[PDB]
């Protein structure tokens, strides 16, 4: 949709939606194993796990169902391997020791972090402030590396092997317009 050129990029709400559209692991509190009751019978998710769950056993559900159950008392989200101090430490060490390559980190970087911090405040094993500070440090370091790398902007192409979602989204318009103008100048010269 146009609505003042919203037809060219993604709004942060759409990014949050497209991230919460992802599977995650859960630790249920209740049981709904069939009598051996209502069928889940959704259209965009394997209902087999939903129908076949039993308490205190790990299983995989999409993110927003887990969030809805966490709004109730039928859920216990299991954090990924990132969200612990001893992994973020080696990660920040990797960024420090390699001043040219962005560290390996998925597209959903910092978004799952924001959502889990906002909702699942209590299920963590680590204090929240430590993790938030380390994530802030990672954000600052990657921001510095982005500014350092942006200095050279060829008119042909570029490679950004390990940028996450929001980092690409925020930078898309400026970069795109600058290279468009450069390409227009070069093509007009010929």
């Amino acid at each position: 949709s146009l609505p003042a050129h919203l037809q060219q990029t993604f709004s942060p709400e759409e990014i949050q939606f497209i991230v919460e559209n992802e599977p995650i692991k859960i630790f249920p509190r209740i049981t709904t194993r069939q009598k051996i009751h209502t069928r889940w019978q959704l259209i965009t998710t394997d209902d087999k796990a939903l129908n076949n769950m039993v308490a205190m056993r790990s299983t995989e559900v999409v993110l927003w169902i887990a969030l809805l159950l966490k709004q109730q008392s039928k859920c216990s989200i299991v954090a990924p391997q990132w969200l612990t101090t001893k992994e973020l430490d080696r990660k920040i060490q990797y960024e420090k020791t390699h001043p040219d390559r962005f560290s390996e980190l998925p597209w959903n970087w910092l978004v799952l972090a924001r959502i889990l911090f906002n909702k699942a405040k209590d299920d963590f094993h680590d204090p929240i402030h430590e993790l938030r500070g380390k994530i802030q440090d990672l954000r600052e370091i990657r921001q510095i590396k982005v500014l350092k790398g942006l200095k050279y902007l060829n008119e042909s192409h570029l490679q950004l092997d390990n940028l996450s979602l929001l980092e690409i989204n925020e930078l898309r318009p400026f970069i795109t317009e600058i290279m468009d103008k450069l390409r227009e100048i070069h093509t007009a010269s010929l």
Binding site: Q71, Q72, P127, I128, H129
Partner: protein, 549 residues
Amino acid sequence: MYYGISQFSEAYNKILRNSSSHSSCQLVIFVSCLNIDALCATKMLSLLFKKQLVQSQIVPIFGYSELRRHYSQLDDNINSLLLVGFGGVIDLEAFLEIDPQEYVISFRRDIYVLDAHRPWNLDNIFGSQIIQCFDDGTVDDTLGEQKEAYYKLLRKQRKKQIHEYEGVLEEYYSQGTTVVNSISAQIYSLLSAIGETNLSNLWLNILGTTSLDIAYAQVYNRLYPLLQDEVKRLVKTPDTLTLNIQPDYYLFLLRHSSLYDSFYYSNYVNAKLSLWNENGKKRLHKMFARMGIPLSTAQETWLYMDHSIKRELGIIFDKNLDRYGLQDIIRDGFVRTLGYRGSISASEFVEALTALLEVGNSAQKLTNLRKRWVSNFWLSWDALDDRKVELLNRGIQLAQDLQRAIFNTGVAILEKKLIKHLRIYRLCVLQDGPDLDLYRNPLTLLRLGNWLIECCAESEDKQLLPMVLASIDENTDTYLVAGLTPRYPRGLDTIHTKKPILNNFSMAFQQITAETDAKVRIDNFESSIIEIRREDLSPFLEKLTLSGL
């Protein structure tokens, strides 16, 4: 009783049986506006019903007329209705013409009245199964005799029984309107019985119980130990939330205003030392000098004021206050701290809330006033959450301003000696002066009257007389009149506290209005506050003088 405390949860379950639905708002709550305990209970209930995802709606009302109109607006789809903070001392069936046979199906739509006033209607309890309430524990013991006559009265020598029943009913009636328990206390008892207690619930319970310190110190002293025990039962990281039992004093915004202004505006010190004339200020300066705090130091903000004397303040007070006899200013209270944001106390927070209720932002003007009151109530409600503090700093500064204005008017009143001492009850009327437009608010008028009655009590007079206070708004040409009961000195023993002083002003007003055709409008939920006409005031007063009180 209808619902004893030992069965409240069952009633809760009933709501889930009737109102818990998917796409139908089947629960509406009416709240007694311009009251703090009602607001605290409503917040607790809103949180609880947001937990189990029960759809609901909150409706503020001001007068019985609005209650009638909105009840007429209701639809049968509403299975359960809530009323909090009012509606205890009158029969709703005769009020809202409920036909028991219309609703029987059971009686369909249940109504839950939840109030505290003790002279509450006997028929409204024992005669109706449609209307049903939460007794605080009053019927099981106190009403052990009154219900017998009602049950009996619901061959020429049997008239003695009828006479005895009529006498018993009359003796039960003709008593003052009083409050003996807090709504939030019962709500928190239900929460504890269920198992949903936490820090927010404890904070709201503390607010509700401490909003009554001004007028019902007996209730406050009865209820304090439970709060203390409950808060005992339940490195400074930026997410600390600490509740503490710290010493605190009867001081107006001690932790947000300078200590000098705190002593100057504190009502108890005012009453004890007569600060409205020069000798009071001289004694205050003598007290400050003997304490040893400089007059330039004591006029600094509490944050920047010296750390060493901040630490030593307790010992300084202990060693100095004895000569002036103000040692009853020291008490034990609650303090809430949130990380690095700062510190706050219950008294300061409730004063901020009260001021925010007071100030914020013929028939048409009255409606406009009654609607801006509801708007201010909702603003105060939104101010509760911890995500907003700019709606609390404003409240604190407005509390400072309102207390200054009240003091400025009270000094003028006591200087002009407008307090006329009749044979039975004192009287004073604010015919003309400054800032009269502020006193159109009943709560502001009650604050002024509370200070006045404290000042009158803290004298050598040995007569406890009811006080009548009146105002004027030239736009409507009407007098707003409120009746006030006498109060004992705060530093008094409990032996002379067998029964709190009752309030007969509501009964006197209703009797005079029934026997004469005055142009009054009695619609406040507080039945001791009425509106009267300027030309009608004086004869009315005469009647009140000549009537039996």
